[PDB]
Amino acid sequence: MSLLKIYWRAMQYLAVERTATITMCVASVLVALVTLAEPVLFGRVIQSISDKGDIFSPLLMWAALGGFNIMAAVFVARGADRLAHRRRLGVMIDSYERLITMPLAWHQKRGTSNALHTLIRATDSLFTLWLEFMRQHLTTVVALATLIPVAMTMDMRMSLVLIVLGVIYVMIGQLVMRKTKDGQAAVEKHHHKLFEHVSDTISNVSVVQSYNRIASETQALRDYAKNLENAQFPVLNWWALASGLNRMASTFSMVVVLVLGAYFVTKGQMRVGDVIAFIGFAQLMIGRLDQISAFINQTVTARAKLEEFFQMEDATADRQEPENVADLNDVKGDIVFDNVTYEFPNSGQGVYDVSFEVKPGQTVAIVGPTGAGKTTLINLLQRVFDPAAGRIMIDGTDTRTVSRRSLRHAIATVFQDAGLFNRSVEDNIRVGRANATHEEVHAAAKAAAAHDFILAKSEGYDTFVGERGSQLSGGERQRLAIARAILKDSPILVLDEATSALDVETEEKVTQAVDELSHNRTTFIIAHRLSTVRSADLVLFMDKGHLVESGSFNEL
Amino acid sequence: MSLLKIYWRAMQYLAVERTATITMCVASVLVALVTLAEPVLFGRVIQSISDKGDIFSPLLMWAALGGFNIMAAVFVARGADRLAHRRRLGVMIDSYERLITMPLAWHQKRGTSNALHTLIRATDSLFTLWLEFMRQHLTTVVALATLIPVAMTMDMRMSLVLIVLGVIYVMIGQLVMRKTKDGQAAVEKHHHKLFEHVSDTISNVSVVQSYNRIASETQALRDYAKNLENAQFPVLNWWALASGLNRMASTFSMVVVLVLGAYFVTKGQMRVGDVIAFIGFAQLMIGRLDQISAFINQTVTARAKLEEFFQMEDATADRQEPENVADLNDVKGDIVFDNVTYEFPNSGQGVYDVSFEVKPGQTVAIVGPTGAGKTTLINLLQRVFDPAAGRIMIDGTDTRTVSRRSLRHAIATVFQDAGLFNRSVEDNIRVGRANATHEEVHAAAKAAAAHDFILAKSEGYDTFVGERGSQLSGGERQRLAIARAILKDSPILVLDEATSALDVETEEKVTQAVDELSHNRTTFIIAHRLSTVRSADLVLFMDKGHLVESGSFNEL
Ligand SMILES: Nc1ncnc2c1ncn2[C@@H]1O[C@H](COP(=O)(O)OP(=O)(O)O)[C@@H](O)[C@H]1O
Ligand SMILES: Nc1ncnc2c1ncn2[C@@H]1O[C@H](COP(=O)(O)OP(=O)(O)O)[C@@H](O)[C@H]1O
Ligand code: VO4
Ligand code: VO4
């Protein structure tokens, strides 16, 4: 019975615009009161024709209440829709902020692209929840609450039947939820499997289309759809049974109310006006119960997605030290490792017992066979995740006591996978300095030879590359990344696989240019080619996370 | 007014299960006729008590009609829900089939990852459309069609009231659509821009989190949200105005009906039983017209997405010559290019004036500076997209006249980006021969040195890599790709960027192993390192898509 918890969370997210929310609630209670009082006035005026006199005023009051209901309906529709859109946008904003705030391991483990789909689905479901909940729930709940005393003061037999009617509705709701929850969980897990398979297949379309695996993959997805649709039937059957049972209850209560009114015809206190007002009350409750039953169904359907979204909301517990914490500045270059190892989750390997000191003014290149632990070493230095048990002494200062904002501000790491956005070359490069100049961009590009091939094609700089540079081949993304790194101008430059299958003349030119630019500071080289480290000062080779010699520039 | 075309296309997707759909329509029309007959019998039995006699039978008949209504409601709910889910799954299946059918360029230009989101959104919108449209619209349309003659045979005064009511509703609907379509289009375009920015930011979270660009990105997305909500208010304002106007129309018509019935009380033809039955008709029409107005609102909201989906469906005009087109066999290796050049859309560069012959039994290596056109040459050899003007002579046969199914069955191309699924290592490698055996898989893996570092970690071969192999580093994706290529065992091997920044010992071992495997066939080398072509027999160098010499293995 987590429905109440879900509704509390929804109201917590919706309790931001205090003024707008309070005005909406006031409008809802007023319109509910008007809708309840309208049949009472209708009964008044129907009984009015039995006597004789100037009883035209009650009809005027009824017309005024009708016009007031119209105006209130307009205002509540407008305000509810506006509030729903504003709060949906705000929730999306804050959720996106936390989502991009998340660390790298959490994204690589689960997120990829499923996180975006979950965010969008949860956001739209919450939008629908906010709108329909607000309107229907406030109106019908206030109507029922104001109806209880009126039914208490009027004939109590009909109220006695009506409370049993409400008991019937809540009982069938409980019954359906009990018979439906397990099937809902199974359906959700099957749908997640299906969506994951679809996303994984679409994201790798070239591989699947280059191996004649279309038939096999579509048959597997057909199997997944079969598995999902196996568990879909019982829950909808139960929903149909619930709809039929409540329809039978509504018709049964209507017949009972009609018979009671017929008995009241023989003798009673009030008139056919009260009788028909009671009938109108009954039919209004029938309709609103139908809408809230449908609403309960939609809420049950979206339950699992809302639960997952709330879990990801509360999963943001990585405290960032809001208080002013010690930063670093004027990084001349002093890097010390002290017996720092890492063990992967549910795995092993990694680095083991690594320690070395870095003096300013000289560069260090790390070489060695693949899988040794060089990339994880680099992303440990930049601290994408915290080491197991060790001290990263930078400028004689631990990496744990340094704020994240200043940690990566004075660092310059090209990635092994040079990822790029789909924006223009200007936007994709001009990220190391938001206040830079086009002359600076040209100089940075010409230092990395990423301009000589772009001035002579594709509208010069203003070219929209595709996703991950899928529109200008792939031999340019490395040049663009190294140009961006040179533009960043940081004291510590990290060349992680910046030297790859390119022209040997291009490689030597890039190496000499970055040598001339980084002679003023200390920089890191992660490459297996022995021709890109002729100017290195303290080179070391690492195997399987264990150093062997870590000797001088010239070693055997 | 593409609304009718949208309904026709949706129904055409729906009327596939002819038996089930026809039964659903028959059940709906029968239950609608029953619901229309109910007030008539109610008015009869209310009028029947005016006289005296054994007139208990009409009351029992009315109860039986209510029971039929209940049972038919259950039947239509269950059948409609089941058919809707089945149709949604089938539509998703076939749309996914066409989506993966598309070539690479169409995905690189527009799809990438937005296509999946569009497909999911369109599919769920179509599900909701099918369900709600079928039930509500069919019931209410049959209701109106059966109601018009009954009221025409009864007093025509209320009939003239009713037709003006309908005219008011349809005219306000047309005016609202005219005032709202432009706002809907602007909202859709802004939403698409917002989603594109969100996806581009999330997909490359490492770069944005390693460059302190979180604040700028979130502020830009806030600006996008502001721009989106600027055009968001007028449309909802117009819908609120329309809702108020139709509420006023409904109350006004109810007032008119009450006045007409009050005059009819003085004198008329039928009784208050028929009067109140017509009152029930009026309120039922009011409610159903309100629901269908809301449905029109949802259809307008989803109209742009449905239009995009239908345009994508109709864009699938890739005729594959359904008749048996001549395939290829006896593939010993005969590849000749004859003056085939390609021009990119709205660009230049590419290959120009290429002419060379391939003799079976020898390997040919393509070298040259980056951006020359080697990757595009390779993927035209595999015919990922159709060349501009020329012939690809394979085994003395043009590549156009061979079906794509068997065209790529005798090829083995490792991509520049080694794409991998998030399945196991065994499932990711065993894709060329599903009926193969573990002995073959082990031999292929140990031939490509993708076994020595996986036999002693993570449950051996049963290791679940993440997306793009983001869980076992990146020095293994190349090994897995080359192992899979060796496993495929095709006559023409293509080592496109199969050699990269790896250990020199590992590189030389891989080269000798692939040489020994491919001695019985022909293969290509796309690499800039000069150490991987010592065993080549016919080397040529291509620059800017223009050859210079294209000589033999030994050249100056
Ligand atoms: N996300 C991960 N989960 C588990 N193990 C990993 C992960 N990323 C890398 N590894 C392990 O770390 C080892 C070294 O990876 P890496 O440092 O990225 O490559 P290299 O050692 O060539 O620089 C690999 O053998 C791999 O198994
Ligand atoms: N999708 C594309 N759209 C436009 N131009 C492209 C596309 N892909 C590649 N090119 C152009 O083709 C040239 C050669 O690319 P490619 O063959 O992939 O690399 P290489 O020449 O090193 O093999 C590049 O300079 C690039 O500008
Ligand atoms: O620019 V390349 O396609 O030779 O990596
Ligand atoms: O296997 V590596 O991360 O040294 O390219």
mmCIF file of N, CA, C and O in Angstrom, chain A residues 81 93 96-97 100-102 107-108 116 196 200-201 204 206 209 212-214 217-218 236 369-370 408 419-423 431 457 468 470 479 497 501 503 528, chain B residues 96-97 100-102 108 196 199-201 204-205 209 212-214 217 221 236 349 369-370 405 408 415 419-423 431 468 470 479 497 501 503 528:
data_model
loop_
_atom_site.group_PDB
_atom_site.id
_atom_site.type_symbol
_atom_site.label_atom_id
_atom_site.label_comp_id
_atom_site.label_asym_id
_atom_site.label_seq_id
_atom_site.Cartn_x
_atom_site.Cartn_y
_atom_site.Cartn_z
ATOM 1 N N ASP A 81 -3.729 23.973 -15.612
ATOM 2 C CA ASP A 81 -2.864 23.653 -16.740
ATOM 3 C C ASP A 81 -1.546 24.414 -16.645
ATOM 4 O O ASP A 81 -0.465 23.842 -16.848
ATOM 5 N N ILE A 93 13.966 20.197 -14.924
ATOM 6 C CA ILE A 93 15.204 20.952 -14.756
ATOM 7 C C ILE A 93 16.038 20.364 -13.627
ATOM 8 O O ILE A 93 17.224 20.050 -13.797
ATOM 9 N N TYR A 96 17.308 16.783 -14.291
ATOM 10 C CA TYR A 96 18.412 16.809 -15.241
ATOM 11 C C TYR A 96 19.694 17.287 -14.578
ATOM 12 O O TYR A 96 20.783 16.760 -14.851
ATOM 13 N N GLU A 97 19.586 18.287 -13.702
ATOM 14 C CA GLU A 97 20.766 18.772 -12.995
ATOM 15 C C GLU A 97 21.402 17.661 -12.168
ATOM 16 O O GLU A 97 22.610 17.412 -12.267
ATOM 17 N N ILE A 100 23.016 14.848 -14.518
ATOM 18 C CA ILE A 100 24.346 15.155 -15.027
ATOM 19 C C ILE A 100 25.345 15.320 -13.892
ATOM 20 O O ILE A 100 26.556 15.220 -14.117
ATOM 21 N N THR A 101 24.871 15.563 -12.668
ATOM 22 C CA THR A 101 25.766 15.632 -11.519
ATOM 23 C C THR A 101 26.343 14.268 -11.155
ATOM 24 O O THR A 101 27.405 14.204 -10.525
ATOM 25 N N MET A 102 25.696 13.183 -11.579
ATOM 26 C CA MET A 102 26.074 11.846 -11.149
ATOM 27 C C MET A 102 27.491 11.500 -11.607
ATOM 28 O O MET A 102 27.972 12.020 -12.616
ATOM 29 N N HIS A 107 26.816 6.059 -14.187
ATOM 30 C CA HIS A 107 26.292 6.133 -15.546
ATOM 31 C C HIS A 107 26.690 4.919 -16.375
ATOM 32 O O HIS A 107 25.851 4.344 -17.078
ATOM 33 N N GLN A 108 27.957 4.511 -16.307
ATOM 34 C CA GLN A 108 28.405 3.348 -17.063
ATOM 35 C C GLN A 108 27.725 2.063 -16.622
ATOM 36 O O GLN A 108 27.529 1.170 -17.453
ATOM 37 N N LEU A 116 17.642 8.530 -19.542
ATOM 38 C CA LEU A 116 16.867 9.570 -20.210
ATOM 39 C C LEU A 116 15.430 9.122 -20.442
ATOM 40 O O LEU A 116 14.488 9.897 -20.229
ATOM 41 N N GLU A 196 15.289 -2.407 -23.073
ATOM 42 C CA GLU A 196 16.741 -2.515 -23.062
ATOM 43 C C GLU A 196 17.245 -3.190 -24.328
ATOM 44 O O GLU A 196 18.227 -2.741 -24.933
ATOM 45 N N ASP A 200 19.668 -1.343 -27.077
ATOM 46 C CA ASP A 200 20.969 -1.917 -27.390
ATOM 47 C C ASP A 200 21.083 -2.272 -28.864
ATOM 48 O O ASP A 200 22.156 -2.112 -29.455
ATOM 49 N N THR A 201 19.999 -2.754 -29.477
ATOM 50 C CA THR A 201 20.069 -3.102 -30.892
ATOM 51 C C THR A 201 20.147 -1.858 -31.767
ATOM 52 O O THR A 201 20.953 -1.803 -32.702
ATOM 53 N N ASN A 204 23.508 0.102 -32.099
ATOM 54 C CA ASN A 204 24.600 -0.582 -32.785
ATOM 55 C C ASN A 204 24.114 -1.102 -34.138
ATOM 56 O O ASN A 204 24.344 -2.250 -34.510
ATOM 57 N N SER A 206 24.957 -0.522 -37.257
ATOM 58 C CA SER A 206 25.900 -0.926 -38.293
ATOM 59 C C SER A 206 26.327 -2.377 -38.117
ATOM 60 O O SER A 206 26.402 -3.133 -39.095
ATOM 61 N N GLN A 209 23.450 -4.708 -39.069
ATOM 62 C CA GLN A 209 23.179 -4.699 -40.499
ATOM 63 C C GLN A 209 24.342 -5.209 -41.331
ATOM 64 O O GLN A 209 24.170 -5.431 -42.533
ATOM 65 N N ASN A 212 23.964 -9.810 -41.317
ATOM 66 C CA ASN A 212 22.751 -10.538 -41.688
ATOM 67 C C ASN A 212 22.029 -11.074 -40.453
ATOM 68 O O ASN A 212 21.540 -12.203 -40.424
ATOM 69 N N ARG A 213 21.974 -10.239 -39.419
ATOM 70 C CA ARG A 213 21.367 -10.626 -38.153
ATOM 71 C C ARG A 213 20.029 -9.933 -37.936
ATOM 72 O O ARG A 213 19.532 -9.869 -36.812
ATOM 73 N N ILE A 214 19.433 -9.407 -39.007
ATOM 74 C CA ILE A 214 18.144 -8.739 -38.874
ATOM 75 C C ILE A 214 17.061 -9.734 -38.473
ATOM 76 O O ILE A 214 16.281 -9.484 -37.546
ATOM 77 N N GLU A 217 17.589 -11.048 -34.799
ATOM 78 C CA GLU A 217 17.294 -10.044 -33.784
ATOM 79 C C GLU A 217 15.803 -9.745 -33.714
ATOM 80 O O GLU A 217 15.242 -9.612 -32.619
ATOM 81 N N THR A 218 15.135 -9.644 -34.865
ATOM 82 C CA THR A 218 13.700 -9.396 -34.825
ATOM 83 C C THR A 218 12.947 -10.590 -34.250
ATOM 84 O O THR A 218 11.941 -10.406 -33.561
ATOM 85 N N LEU A 236 -5.715 -7.151 -16.963
ATOM 86 C CA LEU A 236 -6.798 -6.497 -17.685
ATOM 87 C C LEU A 236 -8.113 -7.238 -17.500
ATOM 88 O O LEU A 236 -9.178 -6.610 -17.468
ATOM 89 N N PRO A 369 51.973 -2.814 -21.880
ATOM 90 C CA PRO A 369 50.997 -3.611 -22.629
ATOM 91 C C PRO A 369 49.569 -3.251 -22.249
ATOM 92 O O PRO A 369 49.293 -2.657 -21.206
ATOM 93 N N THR A 370 48.652 -3.624 -23.136
ATOM 94 C CA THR A 370 47.247 -3.285 -22.965
ATOM 95 C C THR A 370 46.668 -3.966 -21.730
ATOM 96 O O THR A 370 47.099 -5.055 -21.343
ATOM 97 N N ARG A 408 39.250 19.826 -11.287
ATOM 98 C CA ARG A 408 39.286 19.638 -12.729
ATOM 99 C C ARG A 408 39.439 20.946 -13.495
ATOM 100 O O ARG A 408 39.550 20.918 -14.725
ATOM 101 N N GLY A 419 34.864 11.863 -27.350
ATOM 102 C CA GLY A 419 33.468 12.156 -27.605
ATOM 103 C C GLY A 419 33.217 13.611 -27.938
ATOM 104 O O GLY A 419 33.836 14.502 -27.350
ATOM 105 N N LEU A 420 32.311 13.868 -28.874
ATOM 106 C CA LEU A 420 31.994 15.219 -29.309
ATOM 107 C C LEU A 420 30.488 15.405 -29.426
ATOM 108 O O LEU A 420 29.731 14.455 -29.639
ATOM 109 N N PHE A 421 30.059 16.655 -29.283
ATOM 110 C CA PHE A 421 28.656 17.001 -29.427
ATOM 111 C C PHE A 421 28.315 17.197 -30.902
ATOM 112 O O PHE A 421 29.179 17.148 -31.779
ATOM 113 N N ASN A 422 27.033 17.431 -31.184
ATOM 114 C CA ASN A 422 26.557 17.602 -32.549
ATOM 115 C C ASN A 422 26.511 19.065 -32.968
ATOM 116 O O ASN A 422 25.981 19.381 -34.037
ATOM 117 N N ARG A 423 27.051 19.962 -32.147
ATOM 118 C CA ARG A 423 27.017 21.385 -32.448
ATOM 119 C C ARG A 423 28.087 21.738 -33.469
ATOM 120 O O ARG A 423 28.730 20.849 -34.035
ATOM 121 N N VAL A 431 35.311 25.577 -25.652
ATOM 122 C CA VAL A 431 34.806 25.146 -24.357
ATOM 123 C C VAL A 431 35.838 25.279 -23.249
ATOM 124 O O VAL A 431 35.464 25.215 -22.066
ATOM 125 N N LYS A 457 37.188 23.163 -46.567
ATOM 126 C CA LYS A 457 36.012 22.328 -46.768
ATOM 127 C C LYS A 457 34.927 22.712 -45.776
ATOM 128 O O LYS A 457 35.210 23.211 -44.684
ATOM 129 N N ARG A 468 28.839 12.312 -32.132
ATOM 130 C CA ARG A 468 30.168 11.712 -32.012
ATOM 131 C C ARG A 468 30.982 11.891 -33.291
ATOM 132 O O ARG A 468 31.784 11.028 -33.654
ATOM 133 N N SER A 470 30.025 11.875 -36.479
ATOM 134 C CA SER A 470 29.680 10.847 -37.449
ATOM 135 C C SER A 470 29.543 11.387 -38.863
ATOM 136 O O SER A 470 29.239 10.617 -39.778
ATOM 137 N N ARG A 479 42.201 15.267 -33.737
ATOM 138 C CA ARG A 479 42.765 16.597 -33.938
ATOM 139 C C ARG A 479 41.941 17.651 -33.214
ATOM 140 O O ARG A 479 42.491 18.561 -32.584
ATOM 141 N N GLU A 497 46.009 8.572 -25.353
ATOM 142 C CA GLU A 497 45.772 8.067 -26.705
ATOM 143 C C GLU A 497 45.451 9.195 -27.679
ATOM 144 O O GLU A 497 44.616 9.050 -28.573
ATOM 145 N N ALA A 501 46.296 6.071 -35.101
ATOM 146 C CA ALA A 501 46.550 5.751 -36.502
ATOM 147 C C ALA A 501 46.307 7.014 -37.323
ATOM 148 O O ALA A 501 45.225 7.257 -37.855
ATOM 149 N N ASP A 503 48.874 10.027 -39.868
ATOM 150 C CA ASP A 503 50.104 10.163 -40.631
ATOM 151 C C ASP A 503 51.300 10.362 -39.706
ATOM 152 O O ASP A 503 51.225 11.055 -38.687
ATOM 153 N N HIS A 528 51.383 3.901 -26.790
ATOM 154 C CA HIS A 528 52.228 2.735 -26.988
ATOM 155 C C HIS A 528 53.305 2.940 -28.041
ATOM 156 O O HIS A 528 54.253 2.150 -28.092
ATOM 157 N N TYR B 96 9.862 -1.419 -35.868
ATOM 158 C CA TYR B 96 11.252 -1.719 -35.550
ATOM 159 C C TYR B 96 11.936 -2.433 -36.706
ATOM 160 O O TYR B 96 13.113 -2.179 -36.999
ATOM 161 N N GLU B 97 11.214 -3.336 -37.371
ATOM 162 C CA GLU B 97 11.782 -4.019 -38.528
ATOM 163 C C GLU B 97 12.173 -3.023 -39.613
ATOM 164 O O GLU B 97 13.308 -3.039 -40.108
ATOM 165 N N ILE B 100 15.294 -0.837 -38.457
ATOM 166 C CA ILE B 100 16.598 -1.467 -38.617
ATOM 167 C C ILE B 100 16.877 -1.800 -40.074
ATOM 168 O O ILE B 100 18.029 -2.059 -40.437
ATOM 169 N N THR B 101 15.850 -1.796 -40.924
ATOM 170 C CA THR B 101 16.063 -2.016 -42.349
ATOM 171 C C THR B 101 16.815 -0.866 -43.010
ATOM 172 O O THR B 101 17.536 -1.095 -43.989
ATOM 173 N N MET B 102 16.697 0.348 -42.474
ATOM 174 C CA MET B 102 17.232 1.532 -43.128
ATOM 175 C C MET B 102 18.754 1.456 -43.251
ATOM 176 O O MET B 102 19.417 0.788 -42.454
ATOM 177 N N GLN B 108 22.529 8.204 -39.591
ATOM 178 C CA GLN B 108 23.501 9.226 -39.226
ATOM 179 C C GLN B 108 22.980 10.638 -39.432
ATOM 180 O O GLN B 108 23.391 11.543 -38.698
ATOM 181 N N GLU B 196 16.532 17.123 -28.218
ATOM 182 C CA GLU B 196 17.818 16.918 -28.872
ATOM 183 C C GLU B 196 18.958 17.402 -27.991
ATOM 184 O O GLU B 196 19.980 16.717 -27.853
ATOM 185 N N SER B 199 19.417 14.891 -25.041
ATOM 186 C CA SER B 199 20.062 13.648 -25.448
ATOM 187 C C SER B 199 21.535 13.863 -25.757
ATOM 188 O O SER B 199 22.384 13.060 -25.348
ATOM 189 N N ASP B 200 21.863 14.943 -26.471
ATOM 190 C CA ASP B 200 23.261 15.205 -26.783
ATOM 191 C C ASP B 200 24.076 15.443 -25.522
ATOM 192 O O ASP B 200 25.241 15.035 -25.453
ATOM 193 N N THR B 201 23.490 16.099 -24.518
ATOM 194 C CA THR B 201 24.225 16.330 -23.281
ATOM 195 C C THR B 201 24.425 15.036 -22.504
ATOM 196 O O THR B 201 25.533 14.752 -22.037
ATOM 197 N N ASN B 204 27.083 12.195 -23.735
ATOM 198 C CA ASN B 204 28.513 12.477 -23.637
ATOM 199 C C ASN B 204 28.817 13.141 -22.295
ATOM 200 O O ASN B 204 29.515 14.150 -22.215
ATOM 201 N N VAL B 205 28.277 12.555 -21.223
ATOM 202 C CA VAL B 205 28.381 13.161 -19.901
ATOM 203 C C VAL B 205 29.822 13.266 -19.418
ATOM 204 O O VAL B 205 30.134 14.150 -18.613
ATOM 205 N N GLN B 209 31.265 16.699 -17.803
ATOM 206 C CA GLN B 209 31.641 16.657 -16.399
ATOM 207 C C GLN B 209 33.132 16.844 -16.178
ATOM 208 O O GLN B 209 33.543 17.127 -15.048
ATOM 209 N N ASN B 212 33.782 21.301 -16.525
ATOM 210 C CA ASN B 212 33.131 22.302 -15.681
ATOM 211 C C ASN B 212 32.127 23.135 -16.478
ATOM 212 O O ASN B 212 32.068 24.360 -16.373
ATOM 213 N N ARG B 213 31.331 22.442 -17.289
ATOM 214 C CA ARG B 213 30.356 23.093 -18.154
ATOM 215 C C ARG B 213 28.925 22.829 -17.698
ATOM 216 O O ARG B 213 27.978 23.043 -18.455
ATOM 217 N N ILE B 214 28.754 22.367 -16.459
ATOM 218 C CA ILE B 214 27.420 22.021 -15.978
ATOM 219 C C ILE B 214 26.528 23.254 -15.911
ATOM 220 O O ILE B 214 25.373 23.227 -16.360
ATOM 221 N N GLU B 217 25.469 24.561 -19.407
ATOM 222 C CA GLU B 217 24.516 23.668 -20.054
ATOM 223 C C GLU B 217 23.138 23.773 -19.417
ATOM 224 O O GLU B 217 22.124 23.856 -20.124
ATOM 225 N N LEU B 221 19.662 25.096 -21.149
ATOM 226 C CA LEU B 221 18.437 24.308 -21.158
ATOM 227 C C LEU B 221 17.301 25.076 -20.489
ATOM 228 O O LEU B 221 16.136 24.948 -20.885
ATOM 229 N N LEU B 236 -3.217 26.755 -24.307
ATOM 230 C CA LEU B 236 -3.992 26.310 -23.155
ATOM 231 C C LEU B 236 -5.032 27.345 -22.761
ATOM 232 O O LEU B 236 -6.119 26.985 -22.299
ATOM 233 N N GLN B 349 35.051 16.606 -51.234
ATOM 234 C CA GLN B 349 36.084 15.629 -50.854
ATOM 235 C C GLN B 349 35.694 14.278 -51.463
ATOM 236 O O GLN B 349 35.123 14.237 -52.564
ATOM 237 N N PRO B 369 47.494 9.540 -45.834
ATOM 238 C CA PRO B 369 47.128 10.453 -44.749
ATOM 239 C C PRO B 369 45.633 10.420 -44.476
ATOM 240 O O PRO B 369 44.822 9.996 -45.300
ATOM 241 N N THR B 370 45.279 10.882 -43.281
ATOM 242 C CA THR B 370 43.897 10.826 -42.825
ATOM 243 C C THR B 370 43.003 11.694 -43.700
ATOM 244 O O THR B 370 43.450 12.686 -44.281
ATOM 245 N N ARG B 405 21.274 -9.540 -49.123
ATOM 246 C CA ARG B 405 21.318 -10.615 -48.140
ATOM 247 C C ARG B 405 22.566 -11.472 -48.310
ATOM 248 O O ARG B 405 23.284 -11.735 -47.340
ATOM 249 N N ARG B 408 26.708 -9.443 -48.459
ATOM 250 C CA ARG B 408 27.570 -9.294 -47.298
ATOM 251 C C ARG B 408 27.855 -10.616 -46.600
ATOM 252 O O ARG B 408 28.572 -10.630 -45.594
ATOM 253 N N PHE B 415 34.981 -2.700 -38.139
ATOM 254 C CA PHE B 415 34.692 -1.279 -38.249
ATOM 255 C C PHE B 415 35.757 -0.467 -37.528
ATOM 256 O O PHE B 415 36.524 -0.981 -36.712
ATOM 257 N N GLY B 419 31.732 -1.762 -32.439
ATOM 258 C CA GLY B 419 30.504 -1.754 -31.670
ATOM 259 C C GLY B 419 30.185 -3.100 -31.058
ATOM 260 O O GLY B 419 30.259 -4.128 -31.736
ATOM 261 N N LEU B 420 29.832 -3.110 -29.778
ATOM 262 C CA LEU B 420 29.500 -4.331 -29.062
ATOM 263 C C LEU B 420 28.191 -4.161 -28.304
ATOM 264 O O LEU B 420 27.835 -3.067 -27.858
ATOM 265 N N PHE B 421 27.470 -5.267 -28.162
ATOM 266 C CA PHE B 421 26.235 -5.279 -27.397
ATOM 267 C C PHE B 421 26.546 -5.529 -25.923
ATOM 268 O O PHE B 421 27.639 -5.970 -25.559
ATOM 269 N N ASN B 422 25.569 -5.260 -25.058
ATOM 270 C CA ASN B 422 25.747 -5.434 -23.623
ATOM 271 C C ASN B 422 25.533 -6.878 -23.186
ATOM 272 O O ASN B 422 25.390 -7.145 -21.989
ATOM 273 N N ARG B 423 25.502 -7.813 -24.134
ATOM 274 C CA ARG B 423 25.359 -9.226 -23.814
ATOM 275 C C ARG B 423 26.708 -9.809 -23.413
ATOM 276 O O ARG B 423 27.684 -9.070 -23.253
ATOM 277 N N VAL B 431 28.212 -14.697 -33.272
ATOM 278 C CA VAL B 431 27.164 -14.063 -34.057
ATOM 279 C C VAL B 431 27.252 -14.400 -35.536
ATOM 280 O O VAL B 431 26.284 -14.143 -36.272
ATOM 281 N N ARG B 468 28.906 -0.672 -25.367
ATOM 282 C CA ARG B 468 30.164 -0.361 -26.043
ATOM 283 C C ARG B 468 31.370 -0.894 -25.274
ATOM 284 O O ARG B 468 32.466 -0.333 -25.352
ATOM 285 N N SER B 470 31.924 -0.892 -22.058
ATOM 286 C CA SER B 470 32.321 0.087 -21.058
ATOM 287 C C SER B 470 32.557 -0.529 -19.688
ATOM 288 O O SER B 470 32.543 0.194 -18.688
ATOM 289 N N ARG B 479 40.338 -6.617 -30.038
ATOM 290 C CA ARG B 479 40.608 -8.050 -30.039
ATOM 291 C C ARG B 479 39.331 -8.844 -30.265
ATOM 292 O O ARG B 479 39.323 -9.817 -31.026
ATOM 293 N N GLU B 497 41.212 -0.598 -39.750
ATOM 294 C CA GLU B 497 41.649 -0.083 -38.452
ATOM 295 C C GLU B 497 41.651 -1.182 -37.393
ATOM 296 O O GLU B 497 41.364 -0.941 -36.219
ATOM 297 N N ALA B 501 46.853 1.403 -31.380
ATOM 298 C CA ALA B 501 47.867 1.578 -30.343
ATOM 299 C C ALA B 501 47.762 0.405 -29.373
ATOM 300 O O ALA B 501 47.069 0.450 -28.358
ATOM 301 N N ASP B 503 50.340 -3.239 -27.968
ATOM 302 C CA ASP B 503 51.706 -3.692 -27.781
ATOM 303 C C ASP B 503 52.292 -4.198 -29.095
ATOM 304 O O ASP B 503 51.607 -4.808 -29.920
ATOM 305 N N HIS B 528 48.002 2.953 -40.887
ATOM 306 C CA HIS B 528 49.077 3.886 -41.178
ATOM 307 C C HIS B 528 50.433 3.417 -40.675
ATOM 308 O O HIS B 528 51.456 3.866 -41.202
#
